[PDB]
Amino acid sequence: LRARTYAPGALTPAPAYCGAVDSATKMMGRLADAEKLLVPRGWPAFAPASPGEDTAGGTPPPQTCGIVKRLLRLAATEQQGPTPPAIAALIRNAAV
Amino acid sequence: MDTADIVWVEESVSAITLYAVWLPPRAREYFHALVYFVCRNAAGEGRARFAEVSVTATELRDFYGSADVSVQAVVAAARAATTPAASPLEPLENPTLWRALYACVLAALERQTGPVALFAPLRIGSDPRTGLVVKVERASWGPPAAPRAALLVAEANIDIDPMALAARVAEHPDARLAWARLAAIRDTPQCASAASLTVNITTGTALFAREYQTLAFPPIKKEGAFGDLVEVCEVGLRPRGHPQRVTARVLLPRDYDYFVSAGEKFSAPALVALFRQWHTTVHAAPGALAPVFAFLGPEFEVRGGPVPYFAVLGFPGWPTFTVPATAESARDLVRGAAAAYAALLGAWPAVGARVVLPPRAWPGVASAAAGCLLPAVREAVARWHPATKIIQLLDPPAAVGPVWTARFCFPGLRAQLLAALADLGGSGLADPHGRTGLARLDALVVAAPSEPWAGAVLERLVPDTCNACPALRQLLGGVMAAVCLQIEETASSVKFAVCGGDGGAFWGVFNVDPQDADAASGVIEDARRAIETAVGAVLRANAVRLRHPLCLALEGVYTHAVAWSQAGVWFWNSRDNTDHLGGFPLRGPAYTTAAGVVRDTLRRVLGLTTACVPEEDALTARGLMEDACDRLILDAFNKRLDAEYWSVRVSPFEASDPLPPTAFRGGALLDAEHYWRRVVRVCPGGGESVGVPVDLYPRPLVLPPVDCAHHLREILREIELVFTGVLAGVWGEGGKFVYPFDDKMSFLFA
Numbered sequence: 001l002r003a004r005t006y007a008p009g010a011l012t013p014a015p016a017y018c019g020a021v022d023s024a025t026k027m028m029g030r031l032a033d034a035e036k037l038l039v040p041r042g043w044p045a046f047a048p049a050s051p052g053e054d055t056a057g058g059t060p061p062p063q064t065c066g067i068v069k070r071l072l073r074l075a076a077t078e079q080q081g082p083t084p085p086a087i088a089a090l091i092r093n094a095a096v
Numbered sequence: 097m098d099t100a101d102i103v104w105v106e107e108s109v110s111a112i113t114l115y116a117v118w119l120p121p122r123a124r125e126y127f128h129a130l131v132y133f134v135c136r137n138a139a140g141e142g143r144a145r146f147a148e149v150s151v152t153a154t155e156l157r158d159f160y161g162s163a164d165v166s167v168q169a170v171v172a173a174a175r176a177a178t179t180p181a182a183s184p185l186e187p188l189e190n191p192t193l194w195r196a197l198y199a200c201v202l203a204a205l206e207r208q209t210g211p212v213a214l215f216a217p218l219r220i221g222s223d224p225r226t227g228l229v230v231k232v233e234r235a236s237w238g239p240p241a242a243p244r245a246a247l248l249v250a251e252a253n254i255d256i257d258p259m260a261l262a263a264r265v266a267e268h269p270d271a272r273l274a275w276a277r278l279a280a281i282r283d284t285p286q287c288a289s290a291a292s293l294t295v296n297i298t299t300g301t302a303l304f305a306r307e308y309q310t311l312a313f314p315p316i317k318k319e320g321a322f323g324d325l326v327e328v329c330e331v332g333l334r335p336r337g338h339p340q341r342v343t344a345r346v347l348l349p350r351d352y353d354y355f356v357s358a359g360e361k362f363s364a365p366a367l368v369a370l371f372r373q374w375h376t377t378v379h380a381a382p383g384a385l386a387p388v389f390a391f392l393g394p395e396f397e398v399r400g401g402p403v404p405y406f407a408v409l410g411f412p413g414w415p416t417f418t419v420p421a422t423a424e425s426a427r428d429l430v431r432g433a434a435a436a437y438a439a440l441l442g443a444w445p446a447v448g449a450r451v452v453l454p455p456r457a458w459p460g461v462a463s464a465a466a467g468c469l470l471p472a473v474r475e476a477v478a479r480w481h482p483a484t485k486i487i488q489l490l491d492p493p494a495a496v497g498p499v500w501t502a503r504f505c506f507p508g509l510r511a512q513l514l515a516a517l518a519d520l521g522g523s524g525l526a527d528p529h530g531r532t533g534l535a536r537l538d539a540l541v542v543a544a545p546s547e548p549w550a551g552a553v554l555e556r557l558v559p560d561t562c563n564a565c566p567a568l569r570q571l572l573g574g575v576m577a578a579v580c581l582q583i584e585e586t587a588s589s590v591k592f593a594v595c596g597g598d599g600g601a602f603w604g605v606f607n608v609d610p611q612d613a614d615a616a617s618g619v620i621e622d623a624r625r626a627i628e629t630a631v632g633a634v635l636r637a638n639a640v641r642l643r644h645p646l647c648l649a650l651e652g653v654y655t656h657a658v659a660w661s662q663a664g665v666w667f668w669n670s671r672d673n674t675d676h677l678g679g680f681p682l683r684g685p686a687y688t689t690a691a692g693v694v695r696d697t698l699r700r701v702l703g704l705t706t707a708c709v710p711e712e713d714a715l716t717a718r719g720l721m722e723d724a725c726d727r728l729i730l731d732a733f734n735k736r737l738d739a740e741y742w743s744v745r746v747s748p749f750e751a752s753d754p755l756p757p758t759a760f761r762g763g764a765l766l767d768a769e770h771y772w773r774r775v776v777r778v779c780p781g782g783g784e785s786v787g788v789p790v791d792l793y794p795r796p797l798v799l800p801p802v803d804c805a806h807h808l809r810e811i812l813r814e815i816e817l818v819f820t821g822v823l824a825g826v827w828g829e830g831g832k833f834v835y836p837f838d839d840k841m842s843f844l845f846a
Contacts, residue, residue, distance in 0.1 A: 039758060042788060042797040044780045073781070073800070080737045083796055 003078055020091050028063055031070060034089040043086070102221045102230065107135045107143070108240050109214055110353055112442070113413050114201065115146070115344070115387050117174035119167070120337045126152045127167050128337045129201050132346060133229070134413060135220070140241050142327070142348045145220070147229045148335050149204045159203075160196040161455040170197060177410075180372050180389040185282040187390050187409075191397065194390060198409060199450040202443060207529045215243065215438050226334045243434065246352040247298040248416075252366035254291045256280045258760040265755065270748060273766040273792075274364075274395040281365060288369045295370060297325070301351050311373055326350060330384070345384040347412055356430060359420035363767040364393060364406065367416075375411055387411045392446050399748045400770040403556065407446040415442065432549035440536065444553070449560040452533050453518075457525070462567035465521025470638050477574030486577060487584045488596050490659060493825030496595070497656035497702075500608060500616050501667065504624065505601040505649050508544055511554045513572060514561065515541055516640050542643055576600075578638075579631060586630035590623040595657075596665070603657075603667075610655075624648055652676070656702060660821025668702055675699065681814060684744045689728070690811050694818060697724045705826060714827045721819050721833065725812070729841050732808065736845070739797060742807050743776045743790050753787035762792045777803040804845045812837060 022030065039045060048066070049057045079085040084094050116130040133145045153167055173193065177186040187194045206212060210232040217240050221231040256277065264276045281288060289312050297304040302324050307317035327348045334341055368391065379386050388410035394401035406416055417433045419426065436444065443451045453461075466477055515537055522534065543550040562568050580599035587594055591607045606623075608616055628648045635642070654676075656668040664679025675698075680691050701717050709716075735741055746752045752775065769791075776788050780800045788799065812835060819833045 038798055040761070042793050042799045044756070044778070044786050044788075044800070045758070069781070077800065078737070081796075083798075086798055 018091070018093065018096070024063070024067065027067060027071075030090060031067070037089050038086060101224060103224055104219060104221045106217065106219050106235065106237050107137055108217055109133050109135050109212065110243075111214075111414055112202075112205075112212075113408075114198070114390075114410055116385060117171065117197075117388070118337065119171050121339070124167070126150055127171060128335070129204075130333075130335065131201070131205060132344075132413070134348065136241060138238060138240070142350070144329055144331060144346050144348055145222070145229050146227070146331070146333055146344065147205065147209060148337070149201065149208055150337075151200055151204050155200050155204070156196065158454045158456045159200045159450060160192065165193065165196075169193065174388065177388045177390055178386050180375050182285060184285060184288070184368060184372050184389060185278065187392060188278060188282055188396050191392065194392065194409070195447050195450065199443065199447045199454075202441070206532065211532075214441065216240065226336075227331070228333065228335070243354070244300065244352045245354060245356045245430075246300070248355045248357045249296045250294070250363075250366045250370060252291050252293045252363070252369055253764070254281065254287060254365055254369075256287065258757075261760050262757065265760075268398055271398050272395070272400045272748070272771075273769045275398055275400070277766055278364070278395060288365070288372065291369060293366070293369065299325070299352055311369065324350065328378070343384045345379065346387075347378070349414060354414055354434075355416040357416060357418050359404075359418050360422065361768070362404075362406075362418050363764060364391075364395060365767070367406070371412060394770050402771050403445060404770055405445055409446075435547075436549055436553060439539070440553075445556075449557070449564055452537055452557075452561060453530060455564050457530070458565040459567055460524050460526075461518060461521040462565065462571055463521075464524030465517050466567075466571050468520065468639065473574060473578055473638055476577055477571060480570050480573040480577070482573075487580055487594060488598075488602075490595050492662075493658075493660050493821040495656075495658045495822075495825045496605060497668075498610055498670070499655065500606040500610070500620075501595075501603065501654045501657050502606065502620055503601070503603040503651045503654075503667070504627070505651055506599075506646070507649060508541075508551070508554070509576075509600055510558055510572065511541055511544070512642055512644065513575060514558060514568070516642055517571060517575075520640065538643060545644070579634065582634040583627060583631055587623065587627055590626050591619065592623050596659070601651075603665075605657075616653075620650065620653065624650060658698075658702075658822060658825060660818055660825065664818065664821075666698060668699065670703075670706075673699070680818075685741050686732075686807065686811065689731075690815055693724055693728055694815065697721060697819075698822065701822070702826075711827075714823070714829060717823070717827070718833075722835065725815070725835050726841075729808065729837075729844075732804065733844055736802060736804060739776055739790060739799060739802065742802055742804070743774045744807075746773045746775055747771070755789065759789055759792040762794075765792055765794070777806055779803050805842065809837065 020030070035043070035046060049055060049059055050062055051060060074087055074090070077086055085096065088094055088096055111134050113132055114129065115132045117127065118129075119127050128148060128150050130146060130148050133147070135143050135145055137143070156167070156170070157163055157165060170193065173186060173190075174197075176183055209229065211234060212218070212232055213234070217235060217237050219233045219235045220229055221233075222229050260280045260283070261273070261276050264279055265271060265273075289310075291311055293306075293308045293311055295304070295306045303320055304322075304325055305317070305319035306315050309316045327350060329346050329348055331344050331346070332341060333344060372389075375389060390409040392407040392409065394404055404418060406418055408415060415437065417430065417437070419429050419433060423429060440451060449455065466474065469477070515534075518534055518537070522531065525531075540550050540554055544554060562572070576599050583599065583602075584594055587604070592604055593607070594602060594604045596603050606616070606619065608619060628646060631648075632646050635646070652667070652669075652674075654667040654669045654674075656670065658666045660666075661679065666678075667676040669675065675695065677691065677695060680694070681687065682691070697720065700720055704717065704720070705713070707713060748771065752773065774790050776790055777785055778788055778800050779785055779802075785803055785806065790797075816833050816835065823829050823831070823833060
């Protein structure tokens with residue numbers, strides 16, 4: 001029950017919002033920055049590919065459906081012990 | 097040679113090291129070496145003495161094991177090693193040459209001067225005109241002094257570009273990372289001068305602490321004086337291989353004999369850099385020779401080794417013992433290490449299998465030993481083949497019960513056989529001084545029963561000798577086959593029936609009323625005694641003599657046995673609930689819970705088997721099995737966020753995943769990677785299943801969700817492999833056991 005549903009305090013009124021709201025492109029920039037921050041401790045890299053690049057490869061789809069998947073996977077990751085979860089590297093707060 | 101000028105003293109020796117290696121003025125057949133002993137008197141007083149030996153080329157080729165070496169290469173490498181400012185890691189180019197050199201020099205010294213030993217009283221006679229030890233003899237004059245230790249702790253910070261490590265790894269796809277670090281450091285020595293270092297040495301009288309921000313400048317933090325740990329000595333020699341006088345400058349320790357370092361985190365480069373700085377500092381003033389600078393370990397080979405050590409061949413002069421810490425038996429470990437160092441003269445484990453006999457003399461000894469035996473035994477030896485079956489008439493799944501079953505063992509047979517066979521074949525040796533080597537082996541055997549370290553040494557040593565020459569393999573196989581046949585023939589008349597084993601250890605069944613308990617304990621002993629006597633007689637028949645008399649041991653008495661393969665077997669005793677399981681893989685922390693579950697379920701099923709019920713019982717049995725599996729999976733849910741729990745071990749000879757680039761940025765964590773590699777598996781996206789080497793990253797970690805379905809399937813296959821056999825054997829069924837993982841509990845981890 002606890003590991004497969006929203007946290008108890010998420011849907012409770014608060015004076016102000018404490019999340020991350022953005023456009024598409026700046027969201028990509030912030031995601032790249034957070035991934036760079038997290039890489040040095042075990043998190044695997046991304047290695048993407050886009051049309052017009054020097055390597056065609058696969059996954060032609062550009063950053064249109066590739067942001068929601070990453071955001072959802074980041075948001076569904078739980079936390080172990082006193083170490084704050086990974087999402088804190090994007091929201092920039094140690095109380096989420 | 098004259099005895100009218102020889103001066104005699106009584107002393108003890110605590111270390112033998114290599115000082116110089118040169119070539120006489122006009123000769124290309126042999127070379128000369130100069131060695132240095134650090135002796136002590138009856139009350140504790142250091143002294144330095146020197147000796148000189150000459151080595152030919154035939155002996156060097158024999159100890160190398162091939163005919164592609166020369167004295168010129170040996171001399172060139174020895175001369176190159178003298179300057180550590182530019183070439184500090186010489187033995188990394190070719191280790192076998194250094195191993196052969198050390199072994200041959202030790203053997204020549206032992207043969208020429210006389211018998212020597214460590215930590216034992218001796219009488220030494222020297223020449224006053226030249227100052228070189230000329231004779232050594234063994235005597236007795238009292239309770240020689242006791243060794244002493246000293247604790248050491250060092251830490252260094254070196255920096256190397258990850259690109260070099262990546263390139264070196266790419267060159268050899270299956271290399272260990274410690275070797276890559278060592279090679280990169282070797283390419284650019286100057287990086288070992290700019291490192292930051294910290295050293296703490298604790299002795300029984302003083303203390304020595306230093307903290308260098310950079311190893312090329314004065315210390316930032318200091319405590320203690322160098323003039324206390326060690327003493328500098330100058331000696332004037334006059335060897336027969338030189339035209340003019342020579343001088344030698346050496347270090348003598350004060351109030352200790354060897355270093356002891358814990359194994360929690362051991363790094364070679366720190367010690368190498370520290371000793372390099374000491375070597376550069378001490379040997380500055382002109383007017384004297386310089387020693388060699390060589391070291392050895394398991395990280396000097398591309399694929400590493402399973403037993404760690406750190407061997408010193410030259411500067412500074414005393415050994416270092418690396419012992420794993422965090423063990424309540426640390427004192428026992430250190431005592432075993434010291435005993436092993438003393439007994440084998442310090443060569444083991446550096447030299448390897450050359451401590452017994454050179455690798456180019458085995459075939460003759462083996463042929464001579466086999467030539468005598470007995471006609472039938474010779475015929476058996478000639479036809480030996482690895483994959484053959486002689487005695488052990490059972491098969492895949494089969495169950496026995498309820499009867500009296502027994503297990504017997506011969507403790508330590510291969511080592512005794514090798515010793516006796518080498519002694520028998522020694523008549524073919526083309527030398528009267530090699531027997532000393534064999535003698536050493538004999539001692540180890542006699543100490544095996546009451547000393548664990550001897551047993552471990554023998555267990556590690558016998559396979560190397562066998563791998564050196566296949567003739568030994570064939571001879572041992574033939575003799576063991578003869579022993580097994582005799583055992584079966586004799587056991588066929590004491591109400592015994594051999595059911596499994598190979599000859600070193602076996603198990604069988606008895607023929608007696610299964611009810612009385614006070615009469616079944618009087619038949620096993622008689623059978624054991626009869627088998628022991630018969631095997632002894634058969635061995636004695638073929639002119640084979642053993643130092644330690646044979647002794648056969650009984651390892652338990654049971655009532656039920658089940659066999660599901662050629663290496664798996666389960667024994668159970670239905671009066672105290674004792675049992676034994678053999679043949680289950682164990683490659684991680686999650687492979688023990690499966691073993692416990694298997695044991696419990698098997699016990700329950702076999703307990704229910706005594707309900708004397710028709711085929712319905714089988715159905716009932718099946719139910720129980722399934723239930724167990726269910727519970728296991730549920731229990732695994734609570735440990736879904738643990739990375740070390742699910743990690744599995746991999747050896748160099750298997751195939752593994754490629755190394756992610758980030759792993760090359762770890763730093764000082766790559767030094768302790770001799771043999772094993774631990775790997776886990778994670779899923780970062782959709783179906784990706786990428787790998788991760790757990791041990792190369794600083795703690796704590798930050799990873800995506802673990803992959804539990806993969807590991808759980810891998811475990812479940814092995815779990816079912818045994819249940820299927822039990823079902824097919826106990827009840828004679830024909831249906832395999834299959835657990836529906838994909839349609840019942842796969843939603844938990846999705």
